[PDB]
Design an enzyme around this catalytic site. Structure first.
Site: not given
Lengths: 202, 201, 202
Positions: C39, C68, C128
Site C-alpha cells: 500500500e 491515506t 481497516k
C-alpha cells in the site's frame, strides 16, 4: 419506567446464542440466578420468536428487551413481539425516532463525545458505552465534568474481575455478555448469582 | 488563536460550582502564569463569569468558553466577550456560527473520521478529548496520515505526563482538575508548577 | 477478489516515506521478503508516480494499492496510476461511492461501532481498524458478538511482538507500517521475512 429499572437492577444480560432453544434456556438460567433484565440480541436466529416465547418469564418478573438492533425493521419485529426496551451497539437516529413513536425505551450505544452529544440531542441520557473494555472506566470519569446529566451502561468485555471498577467510576448498570451467558444452563445460573452478588458487594 | 496556543501551550479548563469560585480560580491560574482561560459552560452563569473577567484581557488574559454544546450557548459566550469557543465534540452548527461571527472554534474529536469531518469544516487545530482514553499514542498515530493536523488534548493531562504529550507532537494542552481543583492558593501554585514543568520540556 | 487475497497473504505493507525513491526502495525490500500486498500512502510525495513505476512488480505477483486516500481526486489519480485497492484512515462516503462505480476495492478505516455500521450500510464488510494501537485486539473481539460477519485489518502499531495477538483475536490481515518499513533495505527485507514466518505460524 425503564430508567428506574436499570437503576434498581444494575445489570442487563446481553444474550447471544446460536438457536432459539439455546437462547430460551440461557434467558431462563440468567433469570433463575437473579438477573431480571434480559436483552435478546438480534444475532440470535429468530430473535423475535425468542422474545415472544419468553412471555412466561415476563409473568415472573423478567424484563425482556432486544439488543443488536441495527434497522428499524428489526426494531419493529422486536417491539411487536413484546420487547420492553431496545438496545443497539451504535447510535441510530432512525431507531430513536421509531422508539419515540412507539413510546419504547431506546438505549443507543456510543463510544465518543460526539456520538454522546448527538444521542443527548435526540433525548437520550442513559447511554450504552460500547465497547466498554476499550475506552474503560476512565471514559466514564472523563464525561462527568462536561456531561454531568449523562449515565452509562458499559457493555463489551465486562467480567467479574472488572465489574466493580465500573461501578466505582459512576456507572448506572452494566451489560454482561460472554462472561455471563456462556456455559451450561447450571453454569449460567451460577454466573448470574456471582454477578448479582459481585455488584451488591462493590 | 493558533499563534496564542503555540506561545502559551496551556489552557486552563475551568469547571467550578459557582461564579465566585470560577472567577477566583481564573485569577489564581492567571496569577500563576496561565494566560489562556477557558470558562466551561458547566460553570453556573458562565456568561457572567466571562463578562466579569473581561478586564483581565487588559492584562493580557485570553478568556474563552468551553463545554459549548448549542448555538444559543455559543451566542451568549461571544456576546459576553469570549475570544475563543471550545467544545468536547464536533458541532457543525457551532462551526458555522463561529465562522460567520469570526470567532475561533476548537471542536473536540476522538476518531480519524471525526478529525476528517472537522478538517472539511475548515479546522486544523483540534481538541483531542478525552486524552486519557486515547493518549499520546493517538497523537503520534495521526502524524502519519494527517501531518498537518495539530491537537490540544484535554482530559487527565498532569504533571507526570505533560512532557510525554509534548513529545508526541501536541500544539498545547488543556488542563482541568490537575490545575483547577483545590483552593485558589493551591490552584495558583499548581499553575506555577505546570508553567515550569512545560518550560522544562 | 481482494477479500480472497487478504486471506491468502494476511499482511499489507503500509508505506510512508519522504521520497519516491525511498518508497520504491522499501516496496522492493518488503516484496523480496515475501510481502505481496503493498500500500503506497498518499503522504509519499508523488505517490501516484510510485504506483505507476512499481507496475513491473505486478507481473511478479505484487498487488499494489494506495492508502491515506482522503479525496475523490486522489482516488481517481491512484486508480489511473494502476492502484488495485484503495484504503483510507477514515470512512468517506464519496470515496466509497466512487470506488463502487469504478469497481475497485475500497477499505475505509473505522474506530467506533457507529462508524462500522455506517460503513456496513455502504456495502463494506472488510474494514481497516485505525488506530489499532489505541483500540487494540479487544475492539476486534468485542465486535465479533454483534457483528460476526465483519472482518478487520488493523493498522497502527502492529509489530512482531503483538502480531499473533491480532490474529488470535480474529483479524483477517494486518497493515504494518514502521515496525516493518523502518530501517535499511536489508533490515526491512529481514523484517518482512520475520512477519511472514510469524503469521504462518499463528
Amino acid at each position: 419506567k425503564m430508567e428506574e429499572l436499570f437503576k434498581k437492577h444494575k445489570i442487563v444480560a446481553v444474550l447471544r446464542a446460536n438457536s432459539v432453544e439455546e437462547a430460551k434456556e440461557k434467558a431462563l438460567a440468567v433469570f433463575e440466578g437473579g438477573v431480571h433484565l434480559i436483552e435478546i440480541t438480534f444475532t440470535v436466529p429468530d430473535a423475535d420468536t425468542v422474545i415472544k416465547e419468553l412471555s412466561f418469564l415476563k409473568e415472573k418478573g423478567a424484563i425482556i428487551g432486544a439488543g443488536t438492533v441495527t434497522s428499524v425493521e428489526q426494531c419493529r419485529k422486536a417491539v411487536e413481539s413484546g420487547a420492553e426496551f431496545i438496545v443497539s451497539p451504535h447510535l441510530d437516529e432512525e431507531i430513536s425516532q421509531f422508539c419515540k413513536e412507539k413510546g419504547v425505551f431506546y438505549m443507543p450505544g456510543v463510544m465518543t463525545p460526539t456520538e454522546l452529544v448527538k444521542a443527548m440531542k435526540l433525548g437520550h441520557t442513559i447511554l450504552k458505552l460500547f465497547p466498554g473494555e476499550v475506552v474503560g472506566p476512565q471514559f466514564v470519569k472523563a464525561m462527568k465534568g462536561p456531561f454531568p446529566n449523562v449515565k452509562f451502561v458499559p457493555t463489551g468485555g465486562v467480567n467479574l474481575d472488572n465489574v466493580c471498577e465500573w461501578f466505582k467510576a459512576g456507572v448506572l448498570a452494566v451489560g454482561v455478555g460472554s462472561a455471563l451467558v456462556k456455559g451450561t444452563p447450571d453454569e449460567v445460573r451460577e454466573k448470574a448469582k456471582a454477578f448479582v452478588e459481585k455488584i451488591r458487594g462493590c
